[model samples]
Target: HTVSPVNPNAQQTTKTVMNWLAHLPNRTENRVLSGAFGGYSHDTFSMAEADRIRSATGQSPAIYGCDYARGWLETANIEDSIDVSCNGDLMSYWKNGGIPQISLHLANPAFQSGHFKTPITNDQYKKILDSSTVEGKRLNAMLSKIADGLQELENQGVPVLFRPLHEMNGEWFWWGLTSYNQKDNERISLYKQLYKKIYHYMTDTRGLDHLIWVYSPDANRDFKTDFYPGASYVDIVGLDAYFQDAYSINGYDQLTALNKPFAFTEVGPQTANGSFDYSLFINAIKQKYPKTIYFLAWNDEWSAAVNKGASALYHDSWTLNKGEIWNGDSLTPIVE
Candidate 1:
């Protein structure tokens, strides 16, 4: 059977999302998209890590990753210069015929919460739905501004793997569960509500037809299934795990059970000594988690540059590096 996007009306997925769906059932023998996370919306935004990986591998990643939180944090605010820097890098990567998958590190609406990771009390979290409260005002503007940035990219004919509320099963982020070991049905339902709100705001309200929504959770956690926004709200599913075997990730059986395109939304080495035979990465995926369609390595210490064996990793026969992406009209991968 042919795979389709969750958003039936979306025009943007025809080429980009379809490229992955074309592989059929989101599972292939050896083919998986190569990718890396370049910027967390840093002040100086560039895919420099991507360039580093390419130089080291003689091949390049087919996908580029970035975040929307920090670009909004440092000086730029949301409306003014967000499109100017971080997204400019995002646009350029798409122009190069590569896929762009953006992850969100959401902010807490209340003033006390500092970063996306700073925890807010469960009572404070519920206030986010009340538009009259500070949490509501902050969240309303945040989602609106994020959608506007997306509108800018859509206007340029780009489709994005827009992943948000990632790792909600883990406590590192403000939107995460109340505790790692226990279950909080309220928090779980709240997380689903927030994710659906964003989906509706972007697709139903803003008329954004370019986004391919993705649902991701931390790799080692249980109850990953609890945070799922369901098939209608998510088109792809991924897991964020670092310093662990990709196939050994805890949520693999659960994520693949969703039957949407699966990916390692975030991954990297435990420590960077530049000697890890990177080919073992894909080898592990092939051996255990063959359903993986793509993976984005985290930047800096976990990056492909400082990590050795990148050449063999990217050059592996099943690896779908940049310039090998399907552009729909031709039998060859996308090209300028």
Candidate 2:
């Protein structure tokens, strides 16, 4: 009488997680979760510094970060979720029972083609989204491989806060709207279309149901809304704020207006010569923007330095470190 189901609990599980974050404002104690990016990458200072900081502070970050582009190219043949050889050491975090948040630092095809710092044009990006051109085909194939990697984790009942094409409003990355042109503002529309394209492919085509998509933009007001892909395509909206004096409410009002959970997806103090009082940073969040569900610090080489108030932030009472919020052993598909 009826057809078989597809990604049966995908929407349900995603909603459950979002609701859990949404309700954080109701709690009297500011139980904000802490996360770190690039924790397992061999080239990063995250793992070693995290260990040192935890040893000194008796706390660990609640979330461990990984990258799809780092492993997808080399480990396309590997299917096992626990295999480190395939995921390029990214699986070690999952194997050790840490919540993983994966992000992508997409390579610039224009640069690959020897353009030498030239940004990829909107037309070229469109070809990748069209799926009919060779560029589109190749791009989709790569995305499919990445989706397969995420599916492996899903099969093991591991849900990931997957952030792709982050800081879309920034000019540094090829996917950014402002990366190529200024007068041709229609690139903003193209960014949204590309985002929707990825969302459909991952959720509808690849059947990856356990991912919570985060739409993150740099704290630049000029282009923040210019390339917004709308709230429907995103489960959570976050900001990547760095090198700032303090947490500004500049983008929070706009993000919260969407009625979705917002967070500081990536953040750190300016890499200056002076020591910053990390306590003031968390205090500002607790007093001003308590609705923020999590704050993920950048890599340790930058975040772990004493001038930035390393480890002291982790040991602070206001911050809920690893195992304090949710541990892998007790984690379930739904947050109850």
Listed per candidate, the RMSD to the true structure in angstroms reads 3.4, 5.6
Checking candidate 1 for backbone clashes, the offending pairs are none
For model 1, what is the error of residue 143's alpha carbon versus the real structure, in angstroms, after optimal superposition?
Answer: 1.2
Best model number under lDDT:
1
Worst 10 residues of 2 by lDDT: 76-85
Tens digits of per-residue lDDT, candidate 2, 65-131, equal 7654532222322221112223433445545544578886544433222221235777787776788
User: How many steric overlaps are in each model, in order?
Assistant: 0, 0
**Candidate 1 regions with alpha-carbon error over 4 angstroms:** 12-16, 22-30, 42-44, 71-84, 272-277, 327-336
lDDT of 2: 0.63
- Model 1 lDDT per residue over 219-239, tens place: 867787889988889888888
TM for candidate 1 is: 0.89
Count of clashing pairs, candidate 2 = 0
